[PDB]
Amino acid sequence: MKTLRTLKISPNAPDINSVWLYKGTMKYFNNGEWETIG
Amino acid sequence: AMQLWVMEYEVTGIGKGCAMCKAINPQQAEMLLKSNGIYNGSSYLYKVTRIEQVIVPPCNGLMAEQVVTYKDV
Amino acid sequence: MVISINQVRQLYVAKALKANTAALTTAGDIVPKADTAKTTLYFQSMSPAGIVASDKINLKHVLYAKATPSEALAHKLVRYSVTLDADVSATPVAGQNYILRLAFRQYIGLSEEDQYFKYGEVIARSGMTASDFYKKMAISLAKNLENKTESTPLVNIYLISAAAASTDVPVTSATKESDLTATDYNQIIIEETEQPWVLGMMPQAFIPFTPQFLTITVDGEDRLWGVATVVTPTKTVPDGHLIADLEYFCMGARGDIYRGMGYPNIIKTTYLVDPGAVYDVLDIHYFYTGSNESVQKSEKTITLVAVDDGSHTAMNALIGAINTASGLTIATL
Amino acid sequence: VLSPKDIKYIETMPDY
Amino acid sequence: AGKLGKFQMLGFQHWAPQKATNLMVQLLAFYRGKSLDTFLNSFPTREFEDDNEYYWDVIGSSRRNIPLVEARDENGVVVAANAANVGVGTSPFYLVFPEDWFADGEVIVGNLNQVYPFRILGDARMEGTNAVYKVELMGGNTQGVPAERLQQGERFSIEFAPVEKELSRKVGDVRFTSPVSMRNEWTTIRIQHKVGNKLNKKLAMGIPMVRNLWMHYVDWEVELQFDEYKNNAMAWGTSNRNLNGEYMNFGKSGNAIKTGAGIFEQTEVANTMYYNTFSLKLLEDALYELSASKLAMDDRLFVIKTGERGAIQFHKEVLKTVSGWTTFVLDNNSTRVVEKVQSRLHSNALSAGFQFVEYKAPNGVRVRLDVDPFYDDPVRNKILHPMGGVAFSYRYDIWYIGTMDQPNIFKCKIKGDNEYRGYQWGSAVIHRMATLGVCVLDPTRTMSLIPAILQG
C-alpha cells in the first residue's frame, strides 16, 4: 500500500514519507500518528 | 484602547496559540481574537486559558509560553 | 398536462348531486338523466353560464365503466435509507473520507440522458462513532442540497433516532449539529420532494434518484462504505394537481381549444375544480356504431370527478345515482 | 472608417 | 501560522516643510481595494431594447422511459414485494403506469431489458389518470417475472411491436414532445453625494505600524464608487421575488424595489458543492460524473478559477495524491525540481522549486488551474482561513463547461447610455443612476466548490 524508501536520523521529526530514527527508537507514520516499533 | 492583553490559548484539537490584543477589559480581548483571528469561521474552537495585562515596570520578562510537544500530538 | 386519448374525452366536475333538471342551480351541479326504457344515459350539468348536457350514451354501446378512488392516484414518494455497511465496518474508520454521491436521473429534461449529481463528504475522526457520523453526514448533505438559492427542492433528508425508530428528525441548511442532540442514529433517510406546478403549463413530474457511494480503504482494500436500500414510502402526493391538470385538457374538447393565446382577445374558461382537494374519478367509456355501413366505432369516454373527505361519500352516491337511472352495475368504491 | 454598428451607437445614443 | 498586524484603518472622527517626493507613497503594509472589472469584463455583453423582463427558448431531450406505479395479477390484487412469481406460464397480468405511453401489441421491458419482455394485449384502460395494460410475457418464459422486478420506480422502455406473418391487425403507435422557456429580470442602482474639490464627512485614515511610532478629486471617487455599485450588483447581487411573483421589499415611494440575481446567485443553483477539506477524491469524481453524461471525450477541459491560496491548496493536495503513487519513481531528470542555474558562487550551482498547476484524471478529464486576483479581497471577504487568506480564495469556480456556440454568461445592457447623472443645487447634491442585469442562460455549465465556512 504505502512505500517509504528513506530513513532519516533526526532528533526532530522527519516528514510523513520518511522513517524516523532517534537514539534507538524507530518511528513511522501511519493513520496520522507517529507509531513506535518495538 | 487603554491596556494591552497577552493571551495564552488553545484551539481545540488543532494546536496551541499565543496572541496579544489592545482592549479595555479582558472580555473584549477574547472578542478581538475570536472575530479577527485566523479561525474566524471556527471561532468556537478558541479556548482562551490565561489573560494577563502587559504591565510596564519590569519591561524585561516573558508574557506567554506555549510549546507543542511530540507527545501531545 | 397533455394526455393521450383513444378518441374524444369529456370531463364534468360533480360538485353536488341533485335529482331533477329544474334543481340544477349551482355551478358544479349534475343530474344523471336517463329514460324509463334504459336505452340512453347522459349527464345534465350546470356550467357557470347555464345548464349544459353531456353526450347521449347508448347503454348497449358501453365498453367499461370503473371508478378510481383518490388514494389510487396518490404518488408514493420513494425513500432511501443510508446506513453504514456492517461488513466493511460498523464504526467509521479514522482518516478516511466518506463521500456520498446522489445520482439524479431526470434533472430539467424528460429523459435520463439529462442527469445531475449532488455530493456530501465527511472525513471521520478517531473518536467518531456511528451516530456522530450520521449527524455530520446529513448536515453535510443538507448544506449542499437544500440551500435557499436553489432552483427546486430535490430531496429531503431525515435522520432516525434508534430509540424512537418511527419519527423523522429533519435537517435543513439552517440546521446545526447543536440541535441534533440524540446519541443513537442508525440511518439517514433521503426522500424526494414535490416538484412545482402551474395548471396546464407545468405538469406534476418527479426527479428520481439513487444514493451511490465512493470507495474507502479500510484495511488497505477499496470498499464502498455504506448500503442504501429502498424502504417503504411514508408520504403521498395528493390528487389535486393532477385533476386540475386533467380538467384543463378536457375543457378544450367541450369549449375553446385556444386557451389564452392571443391574450386580451380570448375566451376564458372558468374551471370548477379546486386544486386543493383530492378527487374520486369515474371514467365511463362507450362508443357509437353507425346505421348500415358505418360499423366503425367512435370510442369516446366521459369523466366524472367528485371530492371525498375521508370515506368516499360523494362518489358512492354518484355511482348509486347512475346505477338507479341507467341500470348498469358500476362497482362502488 | 465608421462601421454600421458605430453609426448605430452614434444613433441610438440620446440627442437628449 | 500566525498573523501580525501591519496597519490600522481609523476614521477621522477618532483623531509645511519640503518633501522628499512629489508622488504619494503607497505602502505594501496596507491592503488595497480590488476592482471586479477584470472579472466582469471577461464575459461579453448584450444589448436590449428596453427594461422589460426577457425570455428565451429552452430545448431539452426526448428519450423517455415510464416508471411503474404498481403491478397487479389477473384478479386485481396488487403484487407485493414479497409475492411469488407473476405471470407464470405466460398468464396475463396488469401493469399500471402514470401515463398513456405504450400502445397495443408493443413489447416493453423492465429494469432488466430483454430478459423479461412484456407484450401488451390491448389499449390502455384508464384508471383516473393511470393507464392499465393487460400484459403477458414474450420470451418463452415459463416461470414468470419475479416480484421485485414489478415494483414502484422501475423504468420501462419500448422495444418494438411484432405480429404474426399472416392475417394480422394493426399494433403500435407514435409519441411527441415539447420544449419550455425561462425568463430573467433587471435591477437599477442609484447614488448621491452632497458636494468643487474637497473631501466630505465619510473619511478614514490609515496609520501603519512602523517601529518608533492633499486635495480630493470628488469627480473621480463618485464614478469609481458607482462603478463598484454596478460591479457588486452585476456579480454579487440577489433576487427578492416569491414563487408567486410578488416582491418582498418596498422603497421610499411605495413601489417595490425590483432586484434580479447577479452572477453568483444564478450560477449557484446547480453544480455547487460545499466542502470542509479539499480532496482530489471529491473534485475528480464530481468533474467526471459531470463529464461522463454531458461531455465528449475530447472536450473535457476544465479551467479551475480560484484565488491565490486556493492554488497552493491545489498544489499541496495533488502532491498528496502524487506521493501515494507507489508504482512510479519521480526523478529530477524529467520533472526537474532541482535544475542548474548559473551563479557566481559555484560552477555547479543549483536551484529548487515546483508547483502542480494541472491534474489529469482518467477518460481524458484534465483539471487545469489559474489564479483570479479578485478572490483575495480584504474588504468584502472577511472570514479568514487558518492556512492564510480570506477563505474565498479557497473557492474553486469552473466556468465554461463544454462548448455552446453562444455565450452562456453575458451582461445585459440597454442600447446607448443607460447611466444617468444629475446635480441638485439647493445643498449641492450630485445624483447618478444606472440599470443593469446579468443573465446566466444554463447554470448547469458552471460548477463551484465553496468552503463550508461560507454557508449557513
> Is E99 exposed, middle or buried, given 0-12, 13-18 or 19+ CB atoms closer than 10 A?
middle
Rounded to whole angstroms, how far apart are CA atoms E393 and E310?
5
Rounded to whole angstroms, how far apart are CA atoms C46 and C31?
9
Question: Nearest residue of C to residue A31 by CA position?
Answer: C95
Residues in chain E within 8 Å Cβ distance of C75: 69, 98
Residues in chain E within 8 Å Cβ distance of C99: 281-282, 285
Rounded to whole angstroms, how far apart are CA atoms E427 and E408?
46
Q: Which chains touch E (3 or more CB pairs under 8 A)?
A: A, B, C, D
C310 Cβ neighbours under 8 A, 6+ residues apart: none
The secondary structure of residue C19, as a DSSP letter, is S
Provide the sign of the torsion angle of the four alpha carbons C188, C73, E67, C143, taken in this order: negative
Cell reading at C223? 470498499
Distance of CA C231 to the CA centre of its chain: 19
Rounded to whole angstroms, how far apart are CA atoms C312 and C297?
34
- Give how far B22 is from chain E: nearest CA, Å: 12
Distances (CA, A) of A15 to A34, A38, C265, C275: 10, 21, 79, 67
Rounded to whole angstroms, how far apart are CA atoms C211 and E176?
32
- Give how far C22 is from chain E: nearest CA, Å: 30
The secondary structure of residue C233, as a DSSP letter, is P
DSSP bridge pairs for C202:
C198
Of C235, C225, C224, C97, the residue nearest C155 (C-alpha): C235
Q: Are E294 and E368 in contact (CB under 8 A)?
A: no
Helix, strand or coil for residue B32? Answer: helix
The secondary structure of residue B54, as a DSSP letter, is -
Helix, strand or coil for residue C99? Answer: strand
Rounded to whole angstroms, how far apart are CA atoms B18 and B9?
6
Strands C16-17 and C29-34: parallel
Residues in chain B within 8 Å Cβ distance of A34: 70, 73
Rounded to whole angstroms, how far apart are CA atoms A32 and C61?
81
Candidates C95, C217, C220; nearest CB to A32: C95
At what resolution in Å was this solved? 3.6
Helix, strand or coil for residue A36? Answer: strand
Q: Are C158 and C170 in contact (CB under 8 A)?
A: yes
Helix, strand or coil for residue C69? Answer: coil
A3 interfaces chain C, CB cutoff of 8 Å = no
Cell reading at C180? 441534533
Cell reading at E121? 394485449
In the PDB record, what is the listed experimental method?
Answer: cryo-EM
Helix, strand or coil for residue C287? Answer: coil
Cell reading at C76? 408514493
The HSE-up count of residue C65 (CA atoms within 13 Å, CB side) is 22
**Per-residue H/E/C for chain E:** CCCCCCEEEEEHHHCCCCCCCCCCCCCCCCCCCCCCHHHHCCCCEEEECCCCCEEEEECCCCCCCEECCEEECCCCCECCCCCCCECCCCCCEEEEECCCCCCCCCEEECCCCCCCEEEECCCCEEECCEEEEEEEECCCCCCCECHHHHCCCCEEEEEECCCCCCCCCCCCCCCCCCCEEEEECCEEEEEEEECCCCCCCCCEEEEECCCCCCCCCHHHHHHHHHHHHHHHHHHCCCCCECCCCCECCECCCCCECCCCCCCCCCHHHCCEEEECCCCHHHHHHHHHHHHHHHCCCCCCEEEEEECCHHHHHHHHHHHHHHCCCCCCCCCCCCCCCCCECCCCCCCCCECCCCCCCCEECCCCCEEEEEECCCCCCCCCCCCCCCCCCCCCCCCEEECCCCCCCCCCEEEEEECCCCEEEEEEECCEEEEEEEEECEEECCHHHCEEEEEHHHCC
Count CB-CB contacts under 10 A for residue C68: 22
The secondary structure of residue A17, as a DSSP letter, is T
The answer to whether the CB atoms of C113 and E99 lie below 8 A apart is no
D3 interfaces chain E, CB cutoff of 8 Å = no
Rounded to whole angstroms, how far apart are CA atoms E273 and C102?
12
Rounded to whole angstroms, how far apart are CA atoms C188 and E289?
23
Q: Are C211 and C144 in contact (CB under 8 A)?
A: no
DSSP bridge pairs for E425:
E428
What backbone torsions phi and psi does residue E299 show, to the nearest 5 degrees? Answer: -100, 70
DSSP bridge pairs for C309:
C311
E128 interfaces chain D, CB cutoff of 8 Å = no
Question: Nearest residue of A to residue B73 by CA position?
Answer: A33
Q: Are C199 and C245 in contact (CB under 8 A)?
A: yes
Candidates E69, E269, E279; nearest CB to C150: E269
Side-by-side strand order, sheet with A25-30: A6-9, A18-22, A25-30, A33-37
Strands E54-58 and C50-52: unpaired
Distance of CA C127 to the CA centre of its chain: 44
Rounded to whole angstroms, how far apart are CA atoms E420 and E432?
5
What residue type is assigned to position E235 of the chain?
Answer: A
Cell reading at E419? 447611466
Q: Are C14 and C30 in contact (CB under 8 A)?
A: yes
Mutate to test the interface with E, among B4, B16, B33, B38 (most CBs of E within 10 A): B38
Give the DSSP H/E element, type plus range, for residue B26.
Answer: helix B26-34
Rounded to whole angstroms, how far apart are CA atoms E131 and E95?
8
**Per-residue H/E/C for D1-16:** CCCHHHHHHHHHCCCC
Of E435, E433, E431, the residue nearest E193 (C-alpha): E431
Q: Are E189 and E233 in contact (CB under 8 A)?
A: yes
Q: Are E270 and E443 in contact (CB under 8 A)?
A: yes
Of C306, C55, C205, the residue nearest E67 (C-alpha): C205
The answer to whether the CB atoms of C113 and E67 lie below 8 A apart is no
Query: At what angle are helices E309-322 and E280-294 packed, to 10 degrees?
Result: 90
The DSSP secondary structure of C122-181, one letter per residue, reads EE--TT--HHHHHHHHHHHHHHHSS-TT-SS--EEEEEEETTT-S-EEEE-TT--TTT--
Dihedral (Cα; E208, E214, E215, E218), 10-degree rounding: -20
D15 interfaces chain E, CB cutoff of 8 Å = no
Rounded to whole angstroms, how far apart are CA atoms E89 and E85?
10
Of E134, E153, E49, the residue nearest E92 (C-alpha): E134
Q: Are E124 and E131 in contact (CB under 8 A)?
A: yes
Cell reading at E415? 442600447
The single residue listed with the C-alpha cell 402514470 is: E98
Residues in chain E within 8 Å Cβ distance of B17: 2
Of C279, C204, C280, the residue nearest C241 (C-alpha): C204
A2 interfaces chain E, CB cutoff of 8 Å = yes
Give the DSSP H/E element, type plus range, for residue C247.
Answer: helix C240-250
Of C282, C208, C197, the residue nearest C242 (C-alpha): C197
